[PDB]
Amino acid sequence: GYKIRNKSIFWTRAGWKNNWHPKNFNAPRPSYGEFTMGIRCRNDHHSFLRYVQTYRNMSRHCKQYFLGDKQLEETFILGLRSLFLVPYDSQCLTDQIKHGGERRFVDQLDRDFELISYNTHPYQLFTYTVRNEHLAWKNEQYEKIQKGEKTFEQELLDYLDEQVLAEKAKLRDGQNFSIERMTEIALHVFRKARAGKVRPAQDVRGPDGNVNDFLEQRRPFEHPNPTGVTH
Amino acid sequence: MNPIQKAWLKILEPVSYVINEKMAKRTGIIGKLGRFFAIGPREYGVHPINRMFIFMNRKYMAFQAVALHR
Amino acid sequence: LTQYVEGQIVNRNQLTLKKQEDIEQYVLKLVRGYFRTTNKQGLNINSVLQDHGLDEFDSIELAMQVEEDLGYVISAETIPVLNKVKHFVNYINHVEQFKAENGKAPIA
Amino acid sequence: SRIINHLRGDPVYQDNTKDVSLRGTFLRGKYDDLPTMIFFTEACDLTANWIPFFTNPQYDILAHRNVWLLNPRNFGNSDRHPSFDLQEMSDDVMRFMYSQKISMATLGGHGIGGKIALAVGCYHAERVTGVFSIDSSPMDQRYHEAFKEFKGYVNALTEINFKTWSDKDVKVFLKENIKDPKWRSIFTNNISKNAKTQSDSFNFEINYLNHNLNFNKADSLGNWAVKNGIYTGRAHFIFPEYSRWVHLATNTLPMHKVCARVKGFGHDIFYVQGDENPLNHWVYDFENYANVVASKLNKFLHSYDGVHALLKDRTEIGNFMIPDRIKSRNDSKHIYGDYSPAHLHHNWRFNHIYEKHDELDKKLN
Amino acid sequence: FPDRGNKRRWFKNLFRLIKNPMGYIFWKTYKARLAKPSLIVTSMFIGFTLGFIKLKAQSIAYSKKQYA
Amino acid sequence: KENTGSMKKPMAKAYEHPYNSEHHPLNFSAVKIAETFHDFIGPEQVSPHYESFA
Amino acid sequence: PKIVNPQLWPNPNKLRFADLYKYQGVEMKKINDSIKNYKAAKFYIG
Numbered sequence: 028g029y030k031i032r033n034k035s036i037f038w039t040r041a042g043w044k045n046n047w048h049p050k051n052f053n054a055p056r057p058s059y060g061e062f063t064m065g066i067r068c069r070n071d072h073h074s075f076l077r078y079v080q081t082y083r084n085m086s087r088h089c090k091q092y093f094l095g096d097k098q099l100e101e102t103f104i105l106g107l108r109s110l111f112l113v114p115y116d117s118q119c120l121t122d123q124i125k126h127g128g129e130r131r132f133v134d135q136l137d138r139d140f141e142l143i144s145y146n147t148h149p150y151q152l153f154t155y156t157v158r159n160e161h162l163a164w165k166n167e168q169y170e171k172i173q174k175g176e177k178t179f180e181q182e183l184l185d186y187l188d189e190q191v192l193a194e195k196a197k198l199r200d201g202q203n204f205s206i207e208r209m210t211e212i213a214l215h216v217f218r219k220a221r222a223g224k225v226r227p228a229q230d231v232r233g234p235d236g237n238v239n240d241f242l243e244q245r246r247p248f249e250h251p252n253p254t255g256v257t258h
Numbered sequence: 259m260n261p262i263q264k265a266w267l268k269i270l271e272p273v274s275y276v277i278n279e280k281m282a283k284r285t286g287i288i289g290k291l292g293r294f295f296a297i298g299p300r301e302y303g304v305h306p307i308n309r310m311f312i313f314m315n316r317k318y319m320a321f322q323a324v325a326l327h328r
Numbered sequence: 329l330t331q332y333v334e335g336q337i338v339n340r341n342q343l344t345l346k347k348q349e350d351i352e353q354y355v356l357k358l359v360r361g362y363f364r365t366t367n368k369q370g371l372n373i374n375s376v377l378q379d380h381g382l383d384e385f386d387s388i389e390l391a392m393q394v395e396e397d398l399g400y401v402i403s404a405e406t407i408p409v410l411n412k413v414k415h416f417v418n419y420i421n422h423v424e425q426f427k428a429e430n431g432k433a434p435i436a
Numbered sequence: 437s438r439i440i441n442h443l444r445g446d447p448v449y450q451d452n453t454k455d456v457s458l459r460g461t462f463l464r465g466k467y468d469d470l471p472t473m474i475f476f477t478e479a480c481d482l483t484a485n486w487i488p489f490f491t492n493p494q495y496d497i498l499a500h501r502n503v504w505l506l507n508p509r510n511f512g513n514s515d516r517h518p519s520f521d522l523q524e525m526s527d528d529v530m531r532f533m534y535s536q537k538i539s540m541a542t543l544g545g546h547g548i549g550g551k552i553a554l555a556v557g558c559y560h561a562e563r564v565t566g567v568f569s570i571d572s573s574p575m576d577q578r579y580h581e582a583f584k585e586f587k588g589y590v591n592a593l594t595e596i597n598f599k600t601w602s603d604k605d606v607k608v609f610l611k612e613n614i615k616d617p618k619w620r621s622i623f624t625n626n627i628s629k630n631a632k633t634q635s636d637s638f639n640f641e642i643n644y645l646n647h648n649l650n651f652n653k654a655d656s657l658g659n660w661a662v663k664n665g666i667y668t669g670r671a672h673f674i675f676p677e678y679s680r681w682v683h684l685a686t687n688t689l690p691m692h693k694v695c696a697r698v699k700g701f702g703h704d705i706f707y708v709q710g711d712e713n714p715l716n717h718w719v720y721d722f723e724n725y726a727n728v729v730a731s732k733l734n735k736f737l738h739s740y741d742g743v744h745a746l747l748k749d750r751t752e753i754g755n756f757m758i759p760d761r762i763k764s765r766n767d768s769k770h771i772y773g774d775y776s777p778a779h780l781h782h783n784w785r786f787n788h789i790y791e792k793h794d795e796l797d798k799k800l801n
Numbered sequence: 802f803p804d805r806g807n808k809r810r811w812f813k814n815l816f817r818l819i820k821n822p823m824g825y826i827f828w829k830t831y832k833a834r835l836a837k838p839s840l841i842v843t844s845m846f847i848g849f850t851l852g853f854i855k856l857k858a859q860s861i862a863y864s865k866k867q868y869a
Numbered sequence: 870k871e872n873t874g875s876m877k878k879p880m881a882k883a884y885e886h887p888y889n890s891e892h893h894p895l896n897f898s899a900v901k902i903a904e905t906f907h908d909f910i911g912p913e914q915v916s917p918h919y920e921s922f923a
Numbered sequence: 924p925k926i927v928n929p930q931l932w933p934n935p936n937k938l939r940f941a942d943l944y945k946y947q948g949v950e951m952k953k954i955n956d957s958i959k960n961y962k963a964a965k966f967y968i969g
């Protein structure tokens with residue numbers, strides 16, 4: 028559709044696409060023992076173990092609020108690894124970062140853990156909201172199954188299995204019911220089912236099969252436009 | 259909608275009956291008068307002042323967190 | 329000593345192995361319980377966790393589980409050397425010997 | 437066979453501009469009931485060339501609408517009349533829609549076809565849902581170099597006399613007089629031999645066309661007159677980045693000048709990223725140009741075409757209420773308020789869907 | 802006939818400005834504010850406007866001095 | 870055999886944070902400020918007329 | 924409280940037109956979240 032035309036878009040004074048060691052005037056220079064009296068530096072060799080304990084904490088402190096949900100603990104682990112694997116899989120040469128990428132990332136994860144220790148990290152609150160909406164939908168299915176009723180998900184599967192039989196009973200010249208064909212059949216049903224939610228199926232017409240719904244409508248007397256004027 | 263609007267409705271329950279059931283559906287100027295002063299939920303009933311506070315409160319509070327978190 | 333399990337509070341139980349045969353069985357049951365492990369039946373005492381879909385971050389989750397089942401306090405300096413089933417077996421023994429001789433748990 | 441159905445007829449020279457009938461190919465849609473699309477090809481250009489574009493599974497345009505690849509007067513198989521007035525040529529479409537029982541249609545065009553399509557919306561807007569113009573603009577193009585060449589080639593074609601000239605004499609004439617490969621191929625395929633091999637002739641009326649172009653006045657097809665007015669409905673324009681017909685610098689302003697609802701570049705006006713090549717006018721040949729045109733076309737048909745002006749998209753149908761002007765309704769005891777405008781069925785006039793659904797509604801109550 | 806739909810349009814816009822002036826001003830000036838001038842120009846506008854208001858206030862005070 | 874399948878009982882609910890709500894979100898972002906802003910200036914004032922007011 | 928309807932026009936069906944009936948509730952839902960904060964602050968203010 029549209030591609031960047033400038034060939035020098037990824038150029039920097041430090042090279043092509045260099046986001047690990049941008050060029051600056053005060054560049055790193057070596058130190059010689061025989062000539063060095065004293066030095067003030069914060070770099071150390073403790074980042075590896077801090078990278079290990081930070082993982083153990085962020086994992087164990089997040090599981091406190093999972094309520095033993097095993098499927099959530101395993102999902103969270105996959106998400107936690109995606110956060111720790113950024114330096115190992117990125118295009119950025121994390122081993123060539125200015126003053127040590129190891130210390131940089133470890134200090135960054137420590138700020139995330141601090142918020143995790145208080146249960147205030149946006150990833151935590153997002154996991155709770157996402158999970159509660161998921162269980163409310165799973166419990167709705169359970170309540171309908173205990174009553175012997177059919178779920179809206181099973182009705183689609185059964186309606187799709189029979190449509191496949193109808194379409195392949197006429198596909199005799201060929202015998203390759205491709206995954207492409209199986210897909211467009213399901214999407215066509217989805218689009219009609221998707222529109223059915225807002226406009227349910229009253230009669231044999233089916234979901235969203237009434238033209239009168241699209242005639243001129245008006246807000247109800249009990250719910251007028253609260254945000255602006257109407258005329 | 260808010261509790262204060264619901265209080266008006268309980269107090270204006272008989273007034274709502276006179277204007278809406280009787281007047282609003284008549285013809286002539288009595289109907290135009292009832293349909294104009296019909297009682298119910300407010301069209302464009304939002305309060306910009308209350309909405310202004312909410313916006314500036316949220317915008318200024320995010321500034322507090324940056325300035326205080328040092 | 330209680331933890332949630334599928335929304336229900338359950339009392340946690342700790343184990344005391346004090347025997348070589350019981351350790352090899354616990355580690356395998358532990359490693360086979362991890363959802364990331366591949367070829368669970370091909371796993372033996374001389375199995376490299378790397379050959380079963382496990383990386384450095386998975387060894388931490390396994391060690392974290394050893395603390396839950398045994399009550400140990402494993403330091404971050406010891407976790408990154410646990411890359412084989414044999415390593416968990418020997419580390420568990422070294423801890424039992426340390427507490428049996430020194431009367432205390434190793435430095436965490 | 438089934439998907440491809442082109443009615444067959446013979447052109448008839450007409451003295452009255454109202455007794456003109458249009459003929460073209462019809463492409464049936466995948467689904468039973470779909471709105472119709474009427475597409476006008478470039479002048480002197482074949483309708484068949486657009487069939488693979490509208491019958492490509494990758495694009496899947498027929499899933500949205502039935503397509504009528506229609507020929508304007510003096511072109512192809514349609515009737516012949518010396519006048520090219522866009523008002524007259526627009527009335528021709530309205531009779532076609534009537535004879536074919538089409539209440540309202542989506543209009544499209546390529547190049548000069550886009551002008552013809554937009555003119556119909558300007559003269560008959562209540563029966564046009566939208567316009568989709570490809571490498572065209574409602575503008576005077578008489579002095580564009582690309583048009584001059586087309587205007588020049590048509591004049592050279594008037595020199596050939598099929599009765600005396602032999603088949604080889606023609607082929608040599610085209611190669612030397614026509615440098616553009618595509619125009620050359622287009623003109624060759626427009627040559628046909630009538631029944632009984634009486635003689636060969638062009639499918640399009642070469643005489644009536646050359647006079648329109650050579651005269652080079654307001655009635656010329658290159659010209660866009662102020663008489664055509666304004667188009668009130670939905671309009672989307674797509675043209676190549678480097679196009680000889682529509683220059684991005686200034687040839688976009690006519691769209692705002694003629695189309696009232698055109699928002700501007702990036703919403704209703706797009707350019708396809710491409711290189712400088714005089715053949716970019718024919719987007720259907722190059723996959724890169726076509727894939728973008730198709731995607732934009734499917735988006736226009738799915739979300740924007742046949743949608744009320746003040747509504748953003750089709751998503752807002754039934755949930756967005758338009759303000760009402762005071763004293764706009766006959767009922768005096770009417771409490772004026774916001775309303776969702778009525779969107780009707782695409783062929784509600786020639787069917788009884790409203791009468792049928794009214795009965796079903798009563799059965800519910 | 803006239804365009805009876807435009808009746809009382811000035812009164813109606815006045816009441817909408819009173820209801821929510823910042824919203825009425827915001828949307829009526831949106832397309833114009835898309836082209837924002839420089840910080841210098843914006844500052845000159847504010848500076849000259851507030852300075853004119855400051856002198857207006859001093860002239861109001863000098864009138865109370867003439868009344869006294 | 871597939872038709873004979875059943876479904877296990879899922880958990881009733883996950884953790885509900887006692888200090889985060891949809892109207893008073895605990896953490897800050899420009900997204901929530903945008904919602905409060907457009908609620909203040911109101912939605913786009915769409916004109917039904919054929920000419921501008923001025 | 925019940926609101927008197929002049930019944931000059933028929934109201935849209937809630938099932939077919941649901942979005943039209945939502946704004947009222949979310950508005951009170953906002954106020955309830957504010958009240959939870961007013962009550963939780965009884966000890967801090969006191």
Ligand SMILES: CCCCCCCCCCCCCCCCCC(=O)OC[C@H](COP(=O)([O-])OCC(O)COP(=O)([O-])OC[C@@H](COC(=O)CCCCCCCCCCCCCCCCC)OC(=O)CCCCCCCCCCCCCCCCC)OC(=O)CCCCCCCCCCCCCCCCC
Nearest residue numbers: 803804805806807808809810811812813814815816818819
């Ligand atoms: C025997 C003794 C008798 C004693 C009694 C004597 C009394 C005689 C009565 C007989 C006179 C009336 C005759 C009947 C008229 C019928 C005509 C008709 O059909 O309707 C036309 C007229 C048409 O209006 P429309 O078609 O609906 O729409 C208007 C347009 O859309 C235009 O609206 P727009 O939105 O587009 O904006 C433009 C508008 C508004 O433009 C403006 O900006 C003007 C705004 C004026 C008001 C504000 C002034 C500013 C100062 C105040 C600030 C307020 C705003 C502040 C905001 C907040 C600030 C922070 O322009 C107008 O001025 C509209 C006026 C209506 C047109 C008439 C021709 C006017 C031309 C002359 C203009 C100059 C006069 C202005 C008079 C005020 C008009 C409202 O409708 C009427 O107004 C009818 C009025 C008749 C009412 C009679 C009621 C009963 C009278 C008796 C009661 C007792 C009186 C006792 C008096 C005692 C002695 C003092």
Ligand SMILES: CCCCCCCCCCCCCCCCCC(=O)OC[C@H](COP(=O)([O-])OCC(O)COP(=O)([O-])OC[C@@H](COC(=O)CCCCCCCCCCCCCCCCC)OC(=O)CCCCCCCCCCCCCCCCC)OC(=O)CCCCCCCCCCCCCCCCC
Nearest residue numbers: 302303304305306307308310816818819820821822823826
């Ligand atoms: C032209 C150049 C020169 C301009 C010079 C300056 C112009 C005047 C400046 C006045 C500024 C005062 C601001 C007051 C606070 C406003 C704060 C606010 O958040 O605004 C929303 C605020 C509404 O928030 P709300 O309280 O939640 O009410 C919403 C409810 O839903 C409402 O429920 P509802 O929808 O059912 O009600 C219908 C609605 C629509 O109906 C109407 O408003 C139309 C008819 C209203 C009557 C005509 C107004 C006459 C003046 C009012 C009385 C004298 C002053 C009172 C003190 C006002 C100052 C607070 O009514 C309203 O909009 C609100 C009520 C209007 C006030 C009426 C009562 C007045 C007495 C106040 C008693 C309480 C205060 C205690 C006394 C204070 C004195 C010690 O608006 C107002 O309340 C009134 C604002 C008036 C502004 C008019 C002019 C604004 C534009 C000036 C442009 C300046 C040029 C520069 C522009 C540059 C552009 C490029």
Ligand SMILES: CCCCCCCCCCCCCCCCCC(=O)OC[C@H](COP(=O)([O-])OCC(O)COP(=O)([O-])OC[C@@H](COC(=O)CCCCCCCCCCCCCCCCC)OC(=O)CCCCCCCCCCCCCCCCC)OC(=O)CCCCCCCCCCCCCCCCC
Nearest residue numbers: 833834835836837838839842845846847849850851852853
């Ligand atoms: C109740 C109290 C009543 C008394 C007070 C009444 C006050 C009424 C004022 C109401 C507002 C004025 C009308 C504005 C219309 C709406 C905005 C607008 O213009 O549309 C945008 C449109 C273009 O702006 P744009 O589309 O955003 O494009 C700009 C680019 O985005 C980016 O920029 P660019 O790169 O393209 O070019 C650089 C930049 C150039 O930089 C500038 O913008 C120049 C402004 C620098 C600051 C000037 C000082 C601030 C003035 C207000 C404070 C007054 C001080 C006290 C006055 C004491 C003496 C009375 O261009 C601009 O951004 C806009 C300049 C266009 C002129 C703006 C309108 C005139 C200035 C405002 C008039 C103020 C009158 C107040 C008193 C009047 C008393 C009768 O402007 C035009 O309408 C074009 C008109 C042609 C303007 C050029 C020729 C003008 C020659 C006459 C000059 C008159 C000077 C008056 C001096 C006053 C006394 C010292």
Ligand SMILES: CCCCCCCCCCCCCCCCCC(=O)OC[C@H](COP(=O)([O-])OCC(O)COP(=O)([O-])OC[C@@H](COC(=O)CCCCCCCCCCCCCCCCC)OC(=O)CCCCCCCCCCCCCCCCC)OC(=O)CCCCCCCCCCCCCCCCC
Nearest residue numbers: 051834835836837838839840841842843844845846847848
């Ligand atoms: C490590 C390296 C250094 C890193 C430093 C870190 C930098 C961090 C940047 C942080 C950015 C903050 C973002 C938030 C603010 C954004 C909002 C904004 O207003 O930006 C303007 C923003 C962007 O404007 P723009 O059109 O894109 O132009 C951008 C630039 O101006 C460019 O325009 P241009 O391309 O046309 O360039 C021409 C330029 C040409 O300038 C020149 O060629 C030379 C300038 C020579 C200045 C000579 C000064 C002489 C002073 C004499 C005074 C003597 C009196 C002293 C009194 C002593 C008493 C004894 O002239 C100007 O642009 C004038 C701009 C005014 C600048 C005022 C500050 C000047 C010094 C700042 C020093 C900061 C340290 C930098 C060190 C770098 C050293 C290498 O304007 C807006 O449109 C937003 C609304 C603004 C409404 C007006 C009211 C705003 C005031 C409130 C703002 C918010 C609170 C205060 C913030 C600070 C404001 C100063």
Ligand SMILES: CCCCCCCCCCCCCCCCCC(=O)OC[C@H](COP(=O)([O-])OCC(O)COP(=O)([O-])OC[C@@H](COC(=O)CCCCCCCCCCCCCCCCC)OC(=O)CCCCCCCCCCCCCCCCC)OC(=O)CCCCCCCCCCCCCCCCC
Nearest residue numbers: 811814815818825826828829830831832833834921922923
């Ligand atoms: C006791 C009796 C006393 C009371 C008596 C009662 C009288 C009460 C007066 C009320 C009058 C009725 C109120 C009607 C609504 C307000 C007036 C209006 O024109 O609204 C429609 C006007 C546009 O009409 P439209 O057709 O509906 O809009 C179509 C498009 O959407 C618009 O955008 P577009 O680009 O798509 O279409 C074209 C657009 C092209 O033109 C424009 O868009 C204008 C460009 C302006 C935006 C450029 C950026 C500058 C704005 C930045 C924001 C700064 C202010 C906020 C920051 C500080 C916070 C306060 O509009 C035009 O066609 C030309 C503009 C209209 C003619 C020029 C009017 C200039 C003055 C208006 C602004 C007032 C300046 C302050 C003066 C007050 C001094 C204190 O709305 C506005 O542009 C802004 C309205 C803000 C007005 C506030 C002042 C209200 C007082 C009105 C009194 C008359 C003006 C006195 C000033 C005299 C200086 C020469």
Ligand SMILES: COC1=C(OC)C(=O)C(C/C=C(\C)CC/C=C(\C)CC/C=C(\C)CC/C=C(\C)CC/C=C(\C)CC/C=C(\C)CC/C=C(/C)CCC=C(C)C)=C(C)C1=O
Nearest residue numbers: 262307308310311312313314315316317318319320321322
């Ligand atoms: C603490 O952290 C902070 C914030 O939160 C993060 C901030 O937002 C901010 C920014 C501040 C804001 C966004 C607030 C902005 C408010 C400003 C500028 C002032 C607002 C002024 C008004 C809205 C006008 C109010 C006018 C009146 C109340 C007078 C009219 C009402 C009258 C006369 C009623 C009588 C009232 C009383 C007797 C008071 C008793 C109280 C009641 C609630 C009784 C109510 C009774 C009834 C019948 C409703 C800061 C600085 C901050 O520090």
